[PDB]
């Protein structure tokens, strides 16, 4: 992901947090990474800020 930096768009990181949160087998310890929400006022603000 460090190769395709500044690439539209940035919200794939949300889907990225879908990947290790599968983890149902065994003894999950997941359901954790809900910190990085979106505020944020425009999508380009989000892209530039999170890419920076």
């Amino acid at each position: 992901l460090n190769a395709d930096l500044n690439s539209i768009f940035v919200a794939i990181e949300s889907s990225a947090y879908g990947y290790p949160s599968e983890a149902d087998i065994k003894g999950l310890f997941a359901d954790f990474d809900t910190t990085s929400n979106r505020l944020g006022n425009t999508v380009k603000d989000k892209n530039a800020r999170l890419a920076a």
Binding site: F9, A11, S14, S15, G18, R38, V43
Partner: peptide, 11 residues
């Protein structure tokens, strides 16, 4: 940005 009901967020 919209929450799809399978708990995700897309454009």
């Amino acid at each position: 940005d919209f929450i799809f009901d399978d708990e995700r967020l897309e454009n």
